[PDB]
Each structure stands twice: as structure tokens, then as C-alpha cells.
Design a protein around this nucleic acid. Sequence first.
RNA 1: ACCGAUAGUGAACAGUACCGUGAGGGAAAGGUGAAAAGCACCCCGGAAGGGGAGUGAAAUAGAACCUGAAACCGUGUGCU
RNA 2: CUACCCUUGGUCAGGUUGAAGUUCAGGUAACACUGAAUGGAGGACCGAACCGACUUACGUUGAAAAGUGAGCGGAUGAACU
RNA 3: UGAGUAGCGAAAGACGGGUGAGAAUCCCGUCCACCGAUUGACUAAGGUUUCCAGAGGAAGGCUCGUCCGCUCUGGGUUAGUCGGGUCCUAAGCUGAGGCCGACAGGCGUAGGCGAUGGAUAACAGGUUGAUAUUCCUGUACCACCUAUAUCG
RNA 4: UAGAAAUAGGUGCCCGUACCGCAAACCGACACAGGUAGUCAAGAUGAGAAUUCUAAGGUGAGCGAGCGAACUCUCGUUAAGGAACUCGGCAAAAUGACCCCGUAACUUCGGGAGAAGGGGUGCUCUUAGAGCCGCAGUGAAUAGGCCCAAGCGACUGUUUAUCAAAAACACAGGUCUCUGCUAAACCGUAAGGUGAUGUAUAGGGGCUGACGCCUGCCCGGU
Lengths: 44, 120, 44, 89
Amino acid sequence: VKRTYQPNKRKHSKVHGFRKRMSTKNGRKVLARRRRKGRKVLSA
Amino acid sequence: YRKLGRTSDQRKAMLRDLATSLIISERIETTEARAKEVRSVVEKLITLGKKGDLASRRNAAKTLRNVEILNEDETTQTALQKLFGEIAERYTERQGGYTRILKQGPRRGDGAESVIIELV
Amino acid sequence: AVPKRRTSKTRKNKRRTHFKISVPGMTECPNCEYKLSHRVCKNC
Amino acid sequence: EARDILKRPVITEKSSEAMAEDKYTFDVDTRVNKTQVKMAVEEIFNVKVASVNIMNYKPKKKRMGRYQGYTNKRRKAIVTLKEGSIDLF
RNA sequence: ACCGAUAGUGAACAGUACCGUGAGGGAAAGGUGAAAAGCACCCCGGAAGGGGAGUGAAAUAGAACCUGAAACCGUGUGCU
RNA sequence: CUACCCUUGGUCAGGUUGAAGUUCAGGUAACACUGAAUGGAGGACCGAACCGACUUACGUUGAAAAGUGAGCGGAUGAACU
RNA sequence: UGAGUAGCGAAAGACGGGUGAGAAUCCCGUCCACCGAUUGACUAAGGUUUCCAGAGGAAGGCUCGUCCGCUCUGGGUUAGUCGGGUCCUAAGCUGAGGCCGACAGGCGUAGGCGAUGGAUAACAGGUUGAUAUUCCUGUACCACCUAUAUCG
RNA sequence: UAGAAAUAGGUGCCCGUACCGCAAACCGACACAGGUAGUCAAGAUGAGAAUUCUAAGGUGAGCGAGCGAACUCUCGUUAAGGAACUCGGCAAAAUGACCCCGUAACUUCGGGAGAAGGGGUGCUCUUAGAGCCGCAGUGAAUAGGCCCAAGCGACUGUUUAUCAAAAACACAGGUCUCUGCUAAACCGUAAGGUGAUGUAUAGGGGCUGACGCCUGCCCGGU
Ligand SMILES: [K+]
Ligand SMILES: [K+]
Ligand SMILES: [K+]
Ligand SMILES: [Mg+2]
Ligand SMILES: [Mg+2]
Ligand SMILES: [Mg+2]
Ligand SMILES: [Mg+2]
Ligand SMILES: [Mg+2]
Ligand SMILES: [Mg+2]
Ligand SMILES: [Mg+2]
Ligand SMILES: [Mg+2]
Ligand SMILES: [Mg+2]
Ligand SMILES: [Mg+2]
Ligand SMILES: [Mg+2]
Ligand SMILES: [Mg+2]
Ligand SMILES: [Mg+2]
Ligand SMILES: [Mg+2]
Ligand SMILES: [Mg+2]
Ligand SMILES: [Mg+2]
Ligand SMILES: [Mg+2]
Ligand SMILES: [Mg+2]
Ligand SMILES: [Mg+2]
Ligand SMILES: [Mg+2]
Ligand SMILES: [Mg+2]
Ligand SMILES: [Mg+2]
Ligand SMILES: [Mg+2]
Ligand SMILES: [Mg+2]
Ligand SMILES: [Mg+2]
Ligand SMILES: [Mg+2]
Ligand SMILES: [Mg+2]
Ligand SMILES: [Mg+2]
Ligand SMILES: [Mg+2]
Ligand SMILES: [Mg+2]
Ligand SMILES: [Mg+2]
Ligand SMILES: [Mg+2]
Ligand SMILES: [Mg+2]
Ligand SMILES: [Mg+2]
Ligand SMILES: [Mg+2]
Ligand SMILES: [Mg+2]
Ligand SMILES: [Mg+2]
Ligand SMILES: [Mg+2]
Ligand SMILES: [Mg+2]
Ligand SMILES: [Mg+2]
Ligand SMILES: [Mg+2]
Ligand SMILES: [Mg+2]
Ligand SMILES: [Mg+2]
Ligand SMILES: [Mg+2]
Ligand SMILES: [Mg+2]
Ligand SMILES: [Mg+2]
Ligand SMILES: [Mg+2]
Ligand SMILES: [Mg+2]
Ligand SMILES: [Mg+2]
Ligand SMILES: [Mg+2]
Ligand SMILES: [Mg+2]
Ligand SMILES: [Mg+2]
Ligand SMILES: [Mg+2]
Ligand SMILES: [Mg+2]
Ligand SMILES: [Mg+2]
Ligand SMILES: [Mg+2]
Ligand SMILES: [Mg+2]
Ligand SMILES: [Zn+2]
């Protein structure tokens, strides 16, 4: 049966990518939180 | 008679293959139950070959496979030709009992009893 | 459907009383070491 | 910059088979185009270049114990000579 | 008159591995020996692994390496 | 994923039926009207692909956190993708 | 503990020969059998080296294993014309100035981005262990540049 | 419109290109009986991409060997009877393709209808007959069971992904009501939008629900 995750490079980059995060204040808050926690990966 | 863990069509086909392989190679290694079943098939075939007539040859053709055998030097013959040629002549004066089974013991993969069945 | 109580060491070994294998039926090879009775050497 | 464009010759069985057909294989800088590679080859080896074929190789997953990683990404140029010859050895 | 590896940071070797579309969640894992002197050589074995011979104060300190409790798993047998 | 929607693409073996119109032959003062032919309409019919999920059997520490087998509904449309 | 118990995930295999310490399970052969509007062939997405060769058999593989999509070492993807960019726009997204809003921001004009559509020049054959309309051979085409004689 | 050649030789960049790809490599925690868009479309049979067997090409399914107990599951047959079973004919059996006859009540005149119910079918020869063989000739596979009557809903469609597909929702049709346009209604604090690049034969909201015949009395209360 069809499952929830149907991968799509373009969709993934456009919704969760770096530039989409930079595009809003709350996305920049996400990036700041992840930098503060010390994550290796900040976004897609 | 044994079922050999196969359907009737599969069992019939396997017995034909084993009988033809025995006729060709004259000595094969198989499991105990398969050999005990195929001794009857092969010996009835040899009986037909000793009979020798055209009807016997066609009845034998009902059971034998269509395999070719390269003989001493690049000369071919069929398993049916060998059965009605050399094999039948070898057993002209023998009344039954053209095969024997020699037990070898269990084999590694499944513990099955390996045996050799050969033409006498 | 499920064990009501665990099986003690004593009961388990009692049950395993008959869980064993037997010595093979074997005979010395008069000419060709030892072999299974009613079997050919197949290696000698 | 011609000696920065060309990093090293590629010596493999396939590259030797290409050498038999006057085709020379180099690892090149990953930021250069095939026109730059042709000019660099002409400047360094004083030969005439008929054509350049170029390709990119993705980083290769690699490990050393618990340390898994990647090799460097590569750019491979195959240079077909019009005239001249190149004595790498 | 703080902790001493289940403690003390989540983290003594990690915001990693792993999980999630994502925001996010988030581990386990310290100790050979004073010194590598880390077992030449022989034997069984394809190897693994062993028995010797050596090193060492010690090898039941041989790297799954200080100590090595209990559960649990075996071998022998004094009484039954 | 799922619901609705927007833009832009794709897909639907075969068989059946035979609307309106048109032509002819009548019929008429004219027009109705009749018959044949043709014509090819329809959220039309039967039925594969495809889309469903009515019954039943199996499965129920599953092959599977919703499936499989056998039939079953739709199948040019408010279709499916 | 339950227990050497349940299970080992839709099915047709047999034999010969080989290799090996070890073979129902690897290789080769013959016969048999299954799919065939597909269990065949080719594109897309997605994955990202799983591809090829040589070597291996601790772990992984529901058994075995000499084998492997597993391990080690070394390799492999070639384009003016294929698909995309140096072309075009749709939905939608964004948006100089601008309008509105406690802040943060929301909306929107010109403009821009954006294919699932429009435009757009290369074909046949051969060849490798692994690439091929990309490499080679043969024969072409398109755009630009220069040299030897209306554009809008 | 304003406005201001051939020939020869040469040059032509970046990104992707391996491999799997209706799967052992993708989505399903698995080398998971599931899900995954398009394209190519052989022969015999047939209306056909149905059916059965094959071609191209691929594959033998990553546990086996025996035995042939009960019981469970899938499958086949069954004397006499034929729904006596059971909540209920659940399941199974029966029907089934093609060609030719024939076909009721009722009806919105389309239908109902494949109504129902019958007949035929192999092979050989001669030009529709004459023969031949079997228990059986669409000799396999695949291919509607039908009729009478009542309730509900007109109808095709839609629904509780994962115990309910229905009489529930929708529907074409009816009616009431709002709305004169910066419409009403709706989203939004606003700007800006939908309504609509529409304008009362239009747009929103309530109720009813094809069609036929109809839809009575009460305005005291809200
Ligand atoms: K390629
Ligand atoms: K009243
Ligand atoms: K009133
Ligand atoms: Mg048997
Ligand atoms: Mg059969
Ligand atoms: Mg390229
Ligand atoms: Mg401690
Ligand atoms: Mg800690
Ligand atoms: Mg030692
Ligand atoms: Mg030793
Ligand atoms: Mg020793
Ligand atoms: Mg030692
Ligand atoms: Mg000690
Ligand atoms: Mg210790
Ligand atoms: Mg098609
Ligand atoms: Mg219809
Ligand atoms: Mg589909
Ligand atoms: Mg549904
Ligand atoms: Mg089904
Ligand atoms: Mg119907
Ligand atoms: Mg239908
Ligand atoms: Mg146990
Ligand atoms: Mg047992
Ligand atoms: Mg038990
Ligand atoms: Mg049991
Ligand atoms: Mg069992
Ligand atoms: Mg299996
Ligand atoms: Mg078949
Ligand atoms: Mg490989
Ligand atoms: Mg194993
Ligand atoms: Mg590998
Ligand atoms: Mg804007
Ligand atoms: Mg303001
Ligand atoms: Mg496109
Ligand atoms: Mg290839
Ligand atoms: Mg390829
Ligand atoms: Mg694979
Ligand atoms: Mg498998
Ligand atoms: Mg699968
Ligand atoms: Mg699937
Ligand atoms: Mg067709
Ligand atoms: Mg078919
Ligand atoms: Mg009966
Ligand atoms: Mg009867
Ligand atoms: Mg009866
Ligand atoms: Mg009764
Ligand atoms: Mg009763
Ligand atoms: Mg039924
Ligand atoms: Mg039929
Ligand atoms: Mg007849
Ligand atoms: Mg209804
Ligand atoms: Mg319906
Ligand atoms: Mg439900
Ligand atoms: Mg319930
Ligand atoms: Mg239901
Ligand atoms: Mg407007
Ligand atoms: Mg109602
Ligand atoms: Mg009503
Ligand atoms: Mg009333
Ligand atoms: Mg009043
Ligand atoms: Zn012996």
C-alpha cells in the first residue's frame, strides 16, 4: 500500500532547504536554534 | 508406491529424467527413495528393450527423454538407441535385476541418504 | 496458551532425559577405518 | 595557470588503451572547462589538440575503521591529439 | 568535609550514531604492562582457535586484555 | 499521506444499442404525419486494462500495523491518472 | 523459561562434469518446467557506487556457501545536435517604488522566477570487463568567426 | 513602418550520463505475496490487449530429506434424496461464447429485454445435400442463473483510509429569502481579495428532492 513518504528532491529542497529557512524570520530562528545546539546539518 | 514429496506430474517427470540419466551415465548418485522408485522404471524399460519390437520401442519412447549421447569418437546416438542397442544386448541372458543400489550415507546439506544406483 | 509458571532447572532436565543421539551403527572395514553398516566405503 | 589546470596524468588500463589511440587522460581542476584544458595541454606539451572530452566523478564513499567518509570529487579530461605526442614517462 | 564511568555535562571515548517530511528527539561506548619487551621458532588446523617454546614479577596481564560478584550454563562425584 | 482546488500533460481491448438530424418514397392546399435508408447521440448496455471494495474463505506473535484467493461495482465520465 | 519448540515469506526440478578443507545450495552442460498485454525490452521519479575485474568468507544472507546487491584492492560514467541551462511563458511564488499594519510583518505595480506545455542542429554501423545518438568509422546538419566576389 | 553570395578554413561552454528502476538497489524497519507515471505490443484461437498454449526474451523463487497418522487449510469426486441445513440457500452447484427462432405484465413509449423459453454447432465429400465417428462436437480454458411480489431511494454518482456503502450525502427539478453593484455573502485588524473581469434569465443563504396528482386549517405565541 502507498506510504506517507514519497521522496522528491525538488519538494524537499523547496520546503526544508536553506534558502526557504532564510526566507522567514521563524526559519532563521530554526537555523539559529540548530547552530546553537551544534548540529552538523542545519537544513536540506 | 512412493510419492517422493511431489505432485503426480512432477514425480512422473523426475522419474523419466532419472531413468534417462541412468541409461546414459550407467551409474548415478541420488537419494534412497528416488533410487528405490526408479529401479522399477529403468528395469521395465530394459524389458522393453529386450523385447525389441517396434511397439516396444514406441512404448519405451513414451518414457525416455530425447537426449543425445556422443559416443567414442564424434558419433552420436539417442538414449532410446542405446537402450535398444548396447543395453538390451548386455542383458539378453539375465532375467530381471538389471540394477543395484549401494548406500553411501548421509550428505552434509540435509542429512539425506545418498546412494549409488548402477546398471548391473 | 502460555506457561503459567517458569520451568525449573529440575523439570527441564527431567524432560531432557530422553533428548539425546545414539552411537552410529558402525562396523570395522575388514580391508578398506570404520564404516556405517550396510553402506559402501565411498571414500576408500 | 596552465600548470594549475592539469593536476596529474591518469594511468590505468583503460587510459593506456586510449593512449594507444593518441588519447591522453588527465585529472584536472574541478572548476575548469574543456577549452581551458585544451589550452593548458597545448601550452605545456607543445602539441595540437583535436578535441577534449570531459567528465565529473562524484565523491566515493570510503572508510578507515569507524571513520567513514568520502574521497575528493574529480574532473577527468580525455585529450585527443591532432599532432605531436606526450612523453609522460 | 563536590562526582568518580548507571555517577559527574547529553557527551572522560557526541549534539555524533540512530529516529523523524520537518520543527525536533537523541544514545551506547574509560583501564594490557613499569617498559611493547604485543608471543621468534615447532606442532594440529583451509582458517579461526589451540598445545608447547619464549617475553614479563605476573600471560586465568595476550589486546573481547586491572579486579571479575550474582543470575545463568556445564564437567566430576560423597550421601540420597 | 489524505481532502478540495489551480496550471499543464496522459490513458480508456473488444462487443451491443441505435436519439436528433438528412435523403428518398409517399401524403398534403400547405403543414402535420408514415416507411426505408443513412446517421452516430448517451453521467446508455455487456466486458479486459484501469479505478474501486459488496460477499466469502484465508490470514489474526500476518508474506502485510488493513493483505491474499474467489467471485463482485464502475469502466466516454460528476471517469481514472 | 517457554524449547531444540513456532517459523525459515506464494513456485519444479533431475542428473553429469568441475572446483574445493568442506557442495542439495557455486560454475559449466543436457533434459525438464514457469511467465510471455509479460516474471520480456525501454524511459521517468527515487536511491546514490549498489556497476566491472581480481582476491575473500569473520559478520550479513532466515539453511549451506567455494557464492553474493557482503568484505578487501584496483577500476568504470566521454555530447555543438540526447535531457536541462546560456530561449519562452502557465498556475503559483516573489516584487523597485507603493498601500496597510502594536512590533514582527501582510498585500501589491512594473519587473522577475517558475514546466507538467511552446521553440530548438545527427543519423547508421562497429567496439569494451565495465560507456556510448557521447568513443571510432562513414555520411550530415546548426550557430558564430575569418578570408577570396541593404538592415530595420 | 519609424529608424540606421558561394566556396575554403576555423570555433562551439556548463550540468546529467555508472548501476537498480513495476524492483533483492525506490516507498513499505526486512534480500517484505503490498504501492510505484509513460513507452514497445509476435504466433495459434478468438470480437478482443478475453481464454489456453507458445515466440522474442527471461525465470526455477536463499532451507532441505522422508513419511503419506489425527487435525487445519486449498482442491476433486460421490449412492438415494434435493434446502429437510441455516438467522438467512452463507458457500458451492447450476447459467455462460457464437448463429438462428421467440419473448409477458407494466411503461415516462425510451424501455422492460440477453425478459422468459427453444433450436443449432465435430469430421469427410459433393455442389444445400450425401455420408463418418464418439457417452459427449463452443468435446479444453474463458464467457449472464432466471422468474413472481413488497419496503426504501427516482436515476449515473458520493460516504465512515483501517468493523457500517446504506434507506445516509449529492443530484436534475421545486419553493422561500436576501442582493441595484464599492451588491449581498465570504476571508482579512487593515490594505487587498473571492463573489465577478459576473449585474436580478445574476449572485449568496434555508428547506425540499426526477416525474405524476397534489400540498388543507391556525398569525394567539416566537
Ligand atoms: K551513459
Ligand atoms: K401563529
Ligand atoms: K406573529
Ligand atoms: Mg513417499
Ligand atoms: Mg497437469
Ligand atoms: Mg558531459
Ligand atoms: Mg566500573
Ligand atoms: Mg555519562
Ligand atoms: Mg600465546
Ligand atoms: Mg598456541
Ligand atoms: Mg603457545
Ligand atoms: Mg602467551
Ligand atoms: Mg588471576
Ligand atoms: Mg579481567
Ligand atoms: Mg497502450
Ligand atoms: Mg455507462
Ligand atoms: Mg496504478
Ligand atoms: Mg473510497
Ligand atoms: Mg479480488
Ligand atoms: Mg450493471
Ligand atoms: Mg461494465
Ligand atoms: Mg528456552
Ligand atoms: Mg524435536
Ligand atoms: Mg510445547
Ligand atoms: Mg509440534
Ligand atoms: Mg515445522
Ligand atoms: Mg523461501
Ligand atoms: Mg506456460
Ligand atoms: Mg557485482
Ligand atoms: Mg550462514
Ligand atoms: Mg562489493
Ligand atoms: Mg508580493
Ligand atoms: Mg505602516
Ligand atoms: Mg518539459
Ligand atoms: Mg551497461
Ligand atoms: Mg546506462
Ligand atoms: Mg538488485
Ligand atoms: Mg528470496
Ligand atoms: Mg518485493
Ligand atoms: Mg509491489
Ligand atoms: Mg489488438
Ligand atoms: Mg492473458
Ligand atoms: Mg450425492
Ligand atoms: Mg446421483
Ligand atoms: Mg429436483
Ligand atoms: Mg427450513
Ligand atoms: Mg432446523
Ligand atoms: Mg452465494
Ligand atoms: Mg463458451
Ligand atoms: Mg452433433
Ligand atoms: Mg440511489
Ligand atoms: Mg449506484
Ligand atoms: Mg470502514
Ligand atoms: Mg462495531
Ligand atoms: Mg464495508
Ligand atoms: Mg475582483
Ligand atoms: Mg431530503
Ligand atoms: Mg421525500
Ligand atoms: Mg403546509
Ligand atoms: Mg399578529
Ligand atoms: Zn572402507
